[PDB]
Ligand binder design. Structure first.
Ligand SMILES: [Co+2]
Ligand SMILES: [Co+2]
Ligand SMILES: [Co+2]
Ligand SMILES: [Co+2]
Ligand SMILES: [Co+2]
Ligand SMILES: [Co+2]
Lengths: 213, 213, 213
């Protein structure tokens, strides 16, 4: 199987986990701006498009940290070996969105082939989940390309035990000499602390400042 | 009657609506900065005050999009022909707020007459709802003039089926050559997507950049 | 006793309180940037560290306003004479956090002695609440020093009657000639309005712009 049961008994977060899961269930959202000045340059020297690269980079970062790939399966806590991005797609024609996923791959060119393929096949499918059930080993990525925002937060009526992170991007902006992308991260406190989210963001930024291949 | 029953059966958002209403009930808030550099100029060339104009402009924008004027009435989904602003008023003397509403009008001078009239009559009424029951065809507007903010979010214990948008303004600020007003929009996902909110904001900005009359 | 029963009967917020407590239970979070340019200078001319001073300053501000020190005790509404800060501590070694508190004092040097003492004694205690039960007369302060954010919000599954404010700080940043610290304030609407939060923030800023002793 593609996940491994986690050793809660010996975890340094064991008390945190029970506290934030059942005693005081909560989570948080944070919005920060990622500098994509370097990445804009890289993309310019290539044929990649922005959105597919950001999915790639975000999935890559998530796949490096266990605490972003936890879930409850059969009442037990597991870590997925790896997770695939579930991203939103906007249909111009109906002005509605759909959520799709494709397999992640550490090889950026194979990821692009996966993405183009999924898009080829469901570009005109206006169902909300054209592919049917969402694979359990997922992360959620959404984009609001039409507007910049300083904050985004999802108010959810019930989030018991849903630990996959939700990342939302807005339209980027030029702030002085920099091109900044607002990114909102929303997690559950049972599995993730402020530290973990900050480590994800610092890692993402690093990725944005590095060669693609 | 002043509303029309909506055709859910043939709506391109029909699956979205059921999903976000009953399967995974949620909403979101977003905060963005509206450039009010042009509007400050217009106001300077006139006798209008800032707050009443922002209510006006926001109500005007809301009244152009159906998805911001939905509600459940008798278990059915309706669109109001038009909605009136319900705005907050601060009382200096008690340091408490009240919520008022007046009829919207596409004629800015009649709107001002409505506003001055409502204010005349309830300026000193410290009840929370001096007028009694809030008309069902409303939008909510609030202002935090004493402080600038980058984000605002309302955490609500229960929001089942309340689809009127909540807009909150902070104190504006000079950012370089621009005067920016932080505005927070909070909607329910059953009726509104990221697209819709972004379209409201882009429309509001346009309005701010145009002649008043 | 260290609290006083509040006169709800004659309060100008009496209707607000019942409304926001039981009819439409809610709260809000707001994130604003505090200019700590002056304070950086003061700290430079001294031996104080940043975090302990911010706890100090925030607790000082809270202790000046009643509406930030309310609670329900025995079904009644009370105001604490004073509240102590409950702050988070990060352990590098385990990469987990703990929450501690020490007695507040209006004398900054005695506060520092209290803080160093509590830290001395529990620096290596990785329990979530090394001291055991949190004193009821508390405010919550947390810090995310590793990342800057524009917004922070806690999504809480149940907040019935918890009125202590939650303040969260991010990493500060240089914005032009200024050093700004993002601060998020999260309150319950039964006890606090936008006015109150804005008054807390304006007061905090004032404090940051003043001599320490
Ligand atoms: Co339990
Ligand atoms: Co791996
Ligand atoms: Co249903
Ligand atoms: Co019309
Ligand atoms: Co009651
Ligand atoms: Co006192």
């Amino acid at each position: 199987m593609n996940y491994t049961k986690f050793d809660v008994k010996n975890w340094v977060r064991r008390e945190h986990f029970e506290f934030y899961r059942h005693r005081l269930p909560c989570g948080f959202s944070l919005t920060s701006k990622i500098d994509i000045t370097t990445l804009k340059k890289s993309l310019d020297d290539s044929a990649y498009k922005f959105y597919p690269v950001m999915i790639y980079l975000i999935a890559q970062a998530v796949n490096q940290f266990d605490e972003l790939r936890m879930a409850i399966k059969d009442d037990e806590l597991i870590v997925w070996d790896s997770v695939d991005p579930q991203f939103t797609v906007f249909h111009q024609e109906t002005e509605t969105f759909s959520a799709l996923s494709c397999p992640y791959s550490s090889d950026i060119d194979q990821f692009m082939v996966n993405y183009l393929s999924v898009m080829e096949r469901y570009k005109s499918d206006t169902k909300l989940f054209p592919q049917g059930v969402t694979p359990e080993n997922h992360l959620n990525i959404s984009a609001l390309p039409w507007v910049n925002f300083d904050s985004f937060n999802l108010n959810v009526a019930n989030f018991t035990d849903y630990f996959a992170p939700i990342i939302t991007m807005a339209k980027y902006q030029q702030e002085g000499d920099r091109l900044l992308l607002p990114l909102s991260v929303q997690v559950h406190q049972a599995v993730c602390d402020g530290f973990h989210v900050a480590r994800f963001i610092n890692r993402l930024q690093e990725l944005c400042n590095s060669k693609l291949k």
